[PDB]
Structure 1
Amino acid sequence: ATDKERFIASLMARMSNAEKIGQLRLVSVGADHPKEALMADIRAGKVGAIFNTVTRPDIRAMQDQVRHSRLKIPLFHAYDVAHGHRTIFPISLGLAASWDPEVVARSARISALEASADGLDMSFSPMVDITRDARWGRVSEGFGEDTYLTSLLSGVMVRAYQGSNLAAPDSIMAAVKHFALYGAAEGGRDYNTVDMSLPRMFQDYLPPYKAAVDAGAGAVMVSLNTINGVPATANRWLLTDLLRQQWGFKGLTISNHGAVKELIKHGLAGNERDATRLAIQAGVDMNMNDDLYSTWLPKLLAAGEIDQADIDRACRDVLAAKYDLGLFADPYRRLGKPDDPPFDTNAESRLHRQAAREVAREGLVLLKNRDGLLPLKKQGRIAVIGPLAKSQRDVIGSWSAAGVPRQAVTVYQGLANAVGERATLLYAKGANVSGDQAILDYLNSYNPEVEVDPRSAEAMLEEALRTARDADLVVAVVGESQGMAHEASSRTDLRIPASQRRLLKALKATGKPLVLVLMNGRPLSLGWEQENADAILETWFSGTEGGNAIADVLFGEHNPSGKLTMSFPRSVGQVPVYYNHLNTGRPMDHPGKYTSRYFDEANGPLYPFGYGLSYTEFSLSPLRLSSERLARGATLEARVTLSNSGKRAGATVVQLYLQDPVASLSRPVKELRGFRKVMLEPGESREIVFRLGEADLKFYDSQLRHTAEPGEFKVFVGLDSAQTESRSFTLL
């Protein structure tokens, strides 16, 4: 037995059931748990962990209370450090668009450095749910629609948070979320029903969670949705059979917020006692906020409705997490010394602006650039118009953790910084983020999140048209506010808000060159924009340095290299659209009536998976395979030469897709199986070599057999999912 198992067995042999049950309780200071009452419960050994306490003096005060409990078992402290702690990086969907594991790893490592510097031990991150439904407000928190890329980045984020040793003072534990399938909510409505086949679940939706487990994630946060009728919180197949027995996870499972009590609303339980029994016997170790475990576990055990082994499993997992975090060696390892001077948590000197700026550059996606309008010269008169141009609150995104809006660089400020006095900027708000007062009241319902200009729409439009007439070109900064792409904010319309589209149509009618800088947390419907704007830059929500990174691209300090990781539908009525779909019996070419299509809109996404432009031109040589036949246990090489055939240095992403065109299940028309992000000076050439073996060729059949079948495979290489060249080989 390891030091950890010996230590835990010796501690648990000493504990009462009250102490073991106390370890399972995860709470936050708030209405339900006032601070002084919570401190008294920590002193009594009734608390296992805290979330949403995020400064060193507040965390140290809580850890000080444990010295009063009989066994002095330390707390751990968690937070939602999703894409940054104090220095906010782009939202995950924009990080994914970097196609660069090292950039994504740097965002996670800095997030862990900052969170651990504030005394935190754990982040409820990474979010690795696959998203094919643009309506869902939580698409901003994932890495897009692709199983290969999301799985790769899931393991990258875990390793970057946890480091070489979970006891390092600058490591935090990753609690991968949301296990499982949360992003397949029916209708894109948050928390809604998820219903899907086991082959789809295993092939497409579960691999990112398994990648996090295999990267050593210490914790798993359980989702709020049903899976095929069974809430994840009560799902013994998911949490025990799959996560523990099949995948071998040895860490901690954490319920979502009030999730145990929500089993009553889901109709699995008629009271809190039965909800508690279902959750702990399914495999939920730690109970977030609703305190059902502390209220009901003793009565359940005395009635023989649960086993002692249910409590022991759950407690062992909490203690094992604390052991790996170093907290039994030193409960203050992330909290410095008792004789440390006080400091300003929010000091500018504790931020990481260089890293945020460098990361944010990599995720920006050039969607359109007519006749080389971009990059802009630093000269002339530039009108900067729209409700997002001066928005600090929106550039940091949803789930901005301890980010301070006043510390963020707006798009306006970024342009001002870039041009100094070489160009003149003219500002007009142009429109409110929405013209619908019910939507503004929603967005401002808890906090003041959206500045509502008191002027009429007409007055703002006249001011913006005067500003555009006084300029050489217009940079319109438009899209969503961050509260439009957040938990529970599902959208029925994927367009830019109507108030802003009215502004864009008015700006277009001036005849001035029109550059759109889009801020948004989900794919948008951009048909009018693709037809009418001169250039389009997707910037997602780019974080604390967003405005500087966006100016870096617009003025060509950085040659855009971002590529989409989620298909952009032409309208909400096409949902879902995603690149790794099945052919059907009647596929549409581009073209007949009797094919799988809509009749009232053009078909396919407006922008496909892997799409994104450059200020330079790239060429690919013909694809070459090392052989036409592949033996089992051997490796196939796919080679292409990439050249920079243009006039500016830049990067692109060479993507490899596979198709299995004859199989015992209908397989996708293509599936991403590799990529290379390659930065080239003008006239440079690189031989790209992909390696494929049997593991790349397997799939789950109807009975969940996971093998590769002999026969043809098609290999596609290109700079997006739509513009590829292909060669075939045969697996023997």
Structure 2
Amino acid sequence: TDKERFIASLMARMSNAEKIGQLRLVSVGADHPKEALMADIRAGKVGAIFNTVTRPDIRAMQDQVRHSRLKIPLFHAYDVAHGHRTIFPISLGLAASWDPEVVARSARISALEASADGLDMSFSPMVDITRDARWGRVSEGFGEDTYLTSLLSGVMVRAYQGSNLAAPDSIMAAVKHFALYGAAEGGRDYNTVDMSLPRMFQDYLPPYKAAVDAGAGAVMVSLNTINGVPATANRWLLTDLLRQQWGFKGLTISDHGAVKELIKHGLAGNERDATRLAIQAGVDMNMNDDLYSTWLPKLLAAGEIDQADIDRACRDVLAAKYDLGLFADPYRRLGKPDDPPFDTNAESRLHRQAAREVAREGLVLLKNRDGLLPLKKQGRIAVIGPLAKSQRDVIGSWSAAGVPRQAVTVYQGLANAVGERATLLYAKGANVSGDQAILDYLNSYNPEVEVDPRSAEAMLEEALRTARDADLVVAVVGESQGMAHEASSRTDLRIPASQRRLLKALKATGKPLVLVLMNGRPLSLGWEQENADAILETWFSGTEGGNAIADVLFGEHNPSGKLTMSFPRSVGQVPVYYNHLNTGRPMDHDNPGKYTSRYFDEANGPLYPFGYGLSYTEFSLSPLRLSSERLARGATLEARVTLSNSGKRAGATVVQLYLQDPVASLSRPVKELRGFRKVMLEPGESREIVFRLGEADLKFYDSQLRHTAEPGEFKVFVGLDSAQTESRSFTLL
């Protein structure tokens, strides 16, 4: 192959200093001042940059490469999680679209905008399975389901990379965080992960394998222990599974300071030993801590590592740079040398219409009493709450190069929608938290949350007056983006107390109460489900979020979002997830018993189940029909249902197919998602939906990690959520 000969030929000319230099991944900042970094690039001591994100800045780095002996080009990476400049909903919101094409569009546009600024790589997609709502990084994933997350994992990779990694509108996908990062004990970030191999193989690993199989060029290794072994030192995970079993041929990248952290994990007593563990486990590239550059020469000289460990890692970095086209033209994403200067943040370089259309699809209607929604554009509308005018929160956590001043707030979305037809009245009502320590945490690094100097009582008095002067209240409440963020684990899943006090006070006005929720995690909403007139889940909906939200509230878009993560009744029920085991003593709702698996001091089950979301119309399903009672090995089974819009407005819903294996060599879940179809229907319109199932859909990992479909009964469920299904049985032969 031309590639392996080109790289072998280059590596033949390289010193070990230069080979080791290729493994170093750094960003400009206090740890690495710009001038020292420029010198290191010229010395061949830098392989890649992260957090340098504009054409002039990236050109200036790539210009330093020209001064190096071998002129090996840099690659430039960034956290393009859910948009680059045009910010789409957070991934948890994108997942709620239940539309691979909507997700692909957000990823395609992200890659286009990032590559347009000179970037070659995103640290995305994040594909960690999340069953614990306390974890601040649940916003970054696709929810609790292995099938949906695996599917969207593949979609994100393919959308980012396109048909050619050398294309100037493509970037390389570095799938993260390999592995199991979202199972952190207590939902505390960075915390211990401990799980059985059958659960690991069946539920948590498939999304990373889906990204590898979609051709992801890079894998970012996680910060957590797996069964006592940090992923960064886990040769089983990075060599035996990722390379030998899965056949991954690309680049492994450490997370930030992950190699040095092997000391705190207690796998290493010093930096030299930590360095040896990471490179021999199969970590190619060393983020920020510089341990590889410091210790690899001494390890090699001493015979503590092999030349083959350095060569493997170096070949992987050069092979990434080759696939990205950077050996053909290191300026392929940076334009021509006499291109005129331009404003990186020009309105003309955004994709607002795409962001607005994508953002509409993820909004989930959780409650709508007496058809209060959609609203009429008339009278007086009170817009109340600390998130109503927040540009910083609507773009969410991991907002990349998104500019808060360019974002549309919920307030501005309503003003754009009503024009002169209605009067909008604003009141802040409350600070995002009443706890000064939480406000100081959120404002610790930068001013992220505006702290109103009024007393809580004064802000409430203004909100009650505003509400009393309106026909209805749109309360814009929930989390600031810093509350659903790396290292922001919550012990309380409710709306913050300052905002719940505001909601209780607004009920005293007797005005219809619409809640617009902004949040990066499932919330506990028992009070709200009892007391609010309508509830719209908007996650953090991005740059055009306010416009998409007004589109739903005024009925231009019929809410079509469905949850991809169960909403617990309280943090005391964590974890709750739809695909749980039956136990030997399941709750019997027809014959309730004390001696069943349940809590006695709270209603059982999630407040809102996986796949739940309402519409402004009604939908019906015909009885489920299977193509046969028996399925021969290697044949496919057809499951058929007719969906009807039995209401008065056009709208979409999601037909969900679930499977149960009720008798197996392992206890298998009560249901597992195995298919879905999002369908848009006119009033009175019907569509026949056909699902195809084969052996592949019936397999599970048994006690001995055999991936097998066992003969016997399977139950097929079809429904518009995980809770309201009809089922039919067949036998596998």
Q: Distance in 2 between matches of 1:615 and 1:113?
A: 35
Cα offset, 1:6, TM superposition: 1.3
Q: Distance in 1 between matches of 2:2 and 2:82?
A: 34
Q: Distance in 1 between matches of 2:140 and 2:556?
A: 28
Cα offset, 1:349, TM superposition: 1.1
Q: Distance in 2 between matches of 1:235 and 1:60?
A: 37
Cα offset, 1:423, TM superposition: 1.1
Give SS of 2:466's match.
helix
1:146-191 Cα deviation digits (max 9, x unpaired): 0000000000000000001000001000000000000000000000
Cα offset, 1:435, TM superposition: 0.3
Partner residue in 2 for 1:55: 54
Give SS of 1:260's match.
coil
Cα offset, 1:71, TM superposition: 1.0
Q: Distance in 2 between matches of 1:692 and 1:337?
A: 51
1:620-667 Cα deviation digits (max 9, x unpaired): 000000000000000000000001111100000000000000000000
Q: Distance in 1 between matches of 2:48 and 2:483?
A: 31
Give SS of 1:265's match.
helix
1:99-118 Cα deviation digits (max 9, x unpaired): 00000000001000110000
Q: Distance in 1 between matches of 2:7 and 2:666?
A: 47
Q: Distance in 2 between matches of 1:642 and 1:181?
A: 37
Q: Distance in 1 between matches of 2:641 and 2:508?
A: 45
Q: Distance in 1 between matches of 2:376 and 2:24?
A: 58
1:16-65 Cα deviation digits (max 9, x unpaired): 11111000000000001100110000001000000000000000000001
Q: Distance in 1 between matches of 2:700 and 2:8?
A: 41
1:461-483 Cα deviation digits (max 9, x unpaired): 01100111111010000000000
Cα offset, 1:384, TM superposition: 0.5
Q: Distance in 2 between matches of 1:603 and 1:538?
A: 22
Q: Distance in 1 between matches of 2:209 and 2:100?
A: 18
1:656-690 Cα deviation digits (max 9, x unpaired): 00000000000000000000000001111110000
Give SS of 1:451's match.
coil
Q: Distance in 2 between matches of 1:6 and 1:628?
A: 56
Structure 1 ranges of 4+ moved more than 6 A: none
Cα offset, 1:3, TM superposition: 1.6
1:683 aligns with 2:684: yes
Q: Distance in 1 between matches of 2:469 and 2:27?
A: 53
1:96-152 Cα deviation digits (max 9, x unpaired): 000000000000010001100000000000000000000000000000000000000
Give SS of 1:540's match.
coil
Q: Distance in 1 between matches of 2:308 and 2:153?
A: 32
Q: How many residues align?
A: 731
Q: Distance in 1 between matches of 2:43 and 2:135?
A: 42
Q: Distance in 2 between matches of 1:589 and 1:349?
A: 59
Cα offset, 1:240, TM superposition: 0.2
1:63-85 Cα deviation digits (max 9, x unpaired): 00111111110000000000011
Partner residue in 2 for 1:376: 375
Q: Distance in 1 between matches of 2:379 and 2:653?
A: 31
Q: Distance in 2 between matches of 1:177 and 1:557?
A: 36
Q: Distance in 2 between matches of 1:345 and 1:261?
A: 36
Does 3-12 or 439-448 show the bigger shift?
3-12
Partner residue in 1 for 2:177: 178
1:307-337 Cα deviation digits (max 9, x unpaired): 0000000000000000000000000000001
1:544-591 Cα deviation digits (max 9, x unpaired): 000000000000000000000000000000000000000000000232
1:173-228 Cα deviation digits (max 9, x unpaired): 00000000000000000000000000000000000000000000000000000000
Cα offset, 1:380, TM superposition: 1.2
Q: Distance in 2 between matches of 1:671 and 1:421?
A: 49
Partner residue in 1 for 2:630: 629
Q: Distance in 2 between matches of 1:482 and 1:546?
A: 14
Q: Distance in 1 between matches of 2:606 and 2:699?
A: 28
Q: Distance in 2 between matches of 1:714 and 1:706?
A: 19
Q: Distance in 2 between matches of 1:432 and 1:728?
A: 53
Q: Distance in 1 between matches of 2:467 and 2:376?
A: 18
Q: Distance in 1 between matches of 2:460 and 2:298?
A: 66
Q: Distance in 1 between matches of 2:65 and 2:426?
A: 55
Q: Distance in 2 between matches of 1:216 and 1:4?
A: 17
Cα offset, 1:368, TM superposition: 0.2
Cα offset, 1:256, TM superposition: 0.3
Partner residue in 1 for 2:732: 731
Q: Distance in 2 between matches of 1:10 and 1:640?
A: 60
Q: Distance in 1 between matches of 2:508 and 2:484?
A: 30
1:397-433 Cα deviation digits (max 9, x unpaired): 0000011101100000000000001111111000000
Q: Distance in 1 between matches of 2:148 and 2:484?
A: 22
Q: Distance in 1 between matches of 2:575 and 2:4?
A: 47
Cα offset, 1:242, TM superposition: 0.1
Give SS of 1:493's match.
coil
Gaps of 5+ in 2: none
Give SS of 2:320's match.
helix
1:383-405 Cα deviation digits (max 9, x unpaired): 10000000000000000001110
Partner residue in 1 for 2:29: 30
Q: Distance in 1 between matches of 2:626 and 2:509?
A: 53
Q: Distance in 1 between matches of 2:614 and 2:420?
A: 29
Q: Distance in 1 between matches of 2:2 and 2:707?
A: 36
Q: Distance in 2 between matches of 1:159 and 1:578?
A: 28
Give SS of 1:339's match.
coil
Q: 1:4-15 counterparts in 2 under 5 A? A: 4-15=3-14
Q: Distance in 2 between matches of 1:422 and 1:613?
A: 28
Q: Distance in 1 between matches of 2:594 and 2:465?
A: 48
Give SS of 2:263's match.
coil
Partner residue in 2 for 1:424: 423
1:344-402 Cα deviation digits (max 9, x unpaired): 11111111100100000000000000110000011111110000000000000000001
- The TM-score with structure 1 as length reference comes to 1.00
Cα offset, 1:592, TM superposition: 1.1
Q: Distance in 2 between matches of 1:600 and 1:351?
A: 51
Cα offset, 1:268, TM superposition: 0.3
Q: Distance in 2 between matches of 1:702 and 1:10?
A: 47
Give SS of 1:264's match.
helix
Q: Distance in 2 between matches of 1:449 and 1:573?
A: 29
- The TM-score with structure 2 as length reference comes to 1.00
Q: Distance in 1 between matches of 2:286 and 2:73?
A: 17
Partner residue in 2 for 1:640: 641
Give SS of 2:156's match.
helix
Q: Distance in 2 between matches of 1:644 and 1:501?
A: 36
1:679-706 Cα deviation digits (max 9, x unpaired): 0011111100000000000000001000
Q: Distance in 2 between matches of 1:611 and 1:421?
A: 36
Identity %: 100
Q: Distance in 1 between matches of 2:426 and 2:60?
A: 47
Cα offset, 1:10, TM superposition: 1.1
Give SS of 2:399's match.
coil
Q: Distance in 2 between matches of 1:138 and 1:315?
A: 31
Q: Distance in 2 between matches of 1:338 and 1:288?
A: 31
Give SS of 1:256's match.
coil
Q: Distance in 1 between matches of 2:683 and 2:601?
A: 44
Give SS of 1:261's match.
coil
Q: Distance in 2 between matches of 1:278 and 1:613?
A: 51
Does 98-107 or 340-349 show the bigger shift?
340-349
